[PDB]
Amino acid sequence: YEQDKTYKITVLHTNDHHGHFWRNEYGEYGLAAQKTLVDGIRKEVAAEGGSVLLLSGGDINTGVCESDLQDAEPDFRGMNLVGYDAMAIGNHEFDNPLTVLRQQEKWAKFPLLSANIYQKSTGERLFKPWALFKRQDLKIAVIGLTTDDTAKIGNPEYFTDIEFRKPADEAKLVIQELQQTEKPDIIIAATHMGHYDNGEHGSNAPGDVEMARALPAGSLAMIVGGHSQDPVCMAAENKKQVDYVPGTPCKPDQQNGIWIVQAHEWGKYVGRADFEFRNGEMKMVNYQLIPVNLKKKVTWEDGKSERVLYTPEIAENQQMISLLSPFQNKGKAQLEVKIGETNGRLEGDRDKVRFVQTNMGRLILAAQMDRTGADFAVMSGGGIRDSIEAGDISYKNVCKVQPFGNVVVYADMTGKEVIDYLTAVAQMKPDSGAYPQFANVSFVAKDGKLNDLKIKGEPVDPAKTYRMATLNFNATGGDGYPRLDNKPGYVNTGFIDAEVLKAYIQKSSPLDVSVYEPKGEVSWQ
Ligand SMILES: [Mn+2]
Ligand SMILES: [Mn+2]
């Protein structure tokens, strides 16, 4: 680069797209609007003599059935048109077999990067660890990293010949590699690792803050992140804003001379970091999270409700609409097909499944016990994402109920462990996602202790072995549930929550909700 010359470089970023190629039911987000916003930034930046690099923190797969059905083809092809330069591989890129990920690399015209994922048998990397870009006179390297929690949360059959090195240790090595060989002017890490306030990762593997603190000072200009699914907007030192509001200031985190950003999820924002580079120094001039047609419900005096834009409207790019329309239309029509029926409403509304036992909890958990051979089961009420009305049930119905690709697991445990486990889970409170839905469990909890604890209507015997089904999310400590993934009787089946529910409905249809109706088997008073 030219000595003492000041170069303008803008870094744009998103993460945890999760199948949101199309705008939502309220006209929010989608890639067609993303494209208009991004093109606009590119025009603005080029007119001032600058450069743009656009990066993703991964988790493109899983979350919208029209996308999932098509293995995120629309999403990757849309990203080509928005003009992504690279992406970190997320954990949900392992929701499908590796061969599917390889064809996603095919569709993508930008590299899917991960330095820290190795084939055990050969000790060789499965993916490109980094990529190089020329922007004006500057050589910029982007390293990709993936949370080593991937191997704990996904299907273990996908990982028998794979290991994840701790990404922070990989990062030290790759940064040193680059510094000694290719000699880039700037290094940025695209990561799928998570932002945790003050590095307090808890049950999660260490993420971005802990990595930044462990690297040499200022060795990365920035970490473009993901996985935790936060807008990284700092209320105070080492504390993110809670309930960040669109269209308000966002101060990114900075740890050991390294900026850490994340743009929440689903294409809701494009982050924009405007830098000046001179003689190796990078200075951030502006940071913002730009809403992509985000909207808030409002109600006027006369009771009329509408959804109003937090910021001015972004038009949908029509080239994107022509590319993506066919995928949307094909997908939607396919997923409306009937897979069974129910003679009553299966209640999955938030104000119910986070407060009382519902028939939807019982249906989901019946499906999970049936697949695993379990005697009883539990999940977070917050993992039940919609209702299914009486009548015909479609593929789309099941997706809305179980959109996130959680894996079904089980644990054989003694009755003594069952007592300890349910006593803890029974302390989760209503008016929270953590509120437990049970199947085949009865008790009266009083004073934090379980009375007349029965499984399948029989008192618990401390010596007897019971099989419990639940999700990978709860089993590994999600919602503060007691960890099961270290018990010797634990098995992660790799079966996906929505598949299991779908197949159960298929083989049990027509459903009679009377079979799934809670009758006070569990109570607190
Ligand atoms: Mn995600
Ligand atoms: Mn993730």
Curated annotation (Swiss-Prot):
Catalysed conversion reaction: UDP-sugar + H2O = UMP + alpha-D-aldose 1-phosphate; a ribonucleoside 5'-phosphate + H2O = a ribonucleoside + phosphate
Top-level taxon in the UniProt lineage: Bacteria
Sites where the protein binds substrate: R350, D351, K352, V353, R354, F473, N474, A475, T476, G477, G478, D479
Keywords assigned: Disulfide bond, Hydrolase, Metal-binding, Nucleotide-binding, Periplasm, Signal, Zinc
GO molecular function terms listed in the Swiss-Prot or TrEMBL record: 5'-nucleotidase activity; metal ion binding; nucleotide binding; UDP-sugar diphosphatase activity
EC number: 3.6.1.45, 3.1.3.5
Top enzyme category: hydrolase
Pfam families linked to this entry: 5_nucleotid_C, Metallophos
A GO BP entry: nucleotide catabolic process
Subcellular location: Periplasm
Broad class of the protein's primary localization: periplasm
Site annotation Transition state stabilizer: residues: H92, D95
Positions bound to Zn(2+) 2: D59, N91, H192, H227
Disulfide bonds: C233-C250
Keyword Disulfide bond: yes
Regulation: The activity of this protein is inhibited by an intracellular protein inhibitor.
Cofactor(s) named in the record: Zn(2+)
Cofactor note: Binds 2 Zn(2+) ions per subunit.
Binding site for Zn(2+) 1: D16, H18, D59, Q229
GO cellular component: outer membrane-bounded periplasmic space
Role this protein plays: Degradation of external UDP-glucose to uridine monophosphate and glucose-1-phosphate, which can then be used by the cell.
Family: Belongs to the 5'-nucleotidase family.
Subunit structure, interactors included: Monomer.
PANTHER family (alphabetical): 5'-NUCLEOTIDASE-RELATED (PTHR11575), PROTEIN USHA (PTHR11575:SF46)
Protein name, entry field: Protein UshA
The organism of origin for this protein: Escherichia coli (strain K12)
Gene name for this UniProt entry: ushA
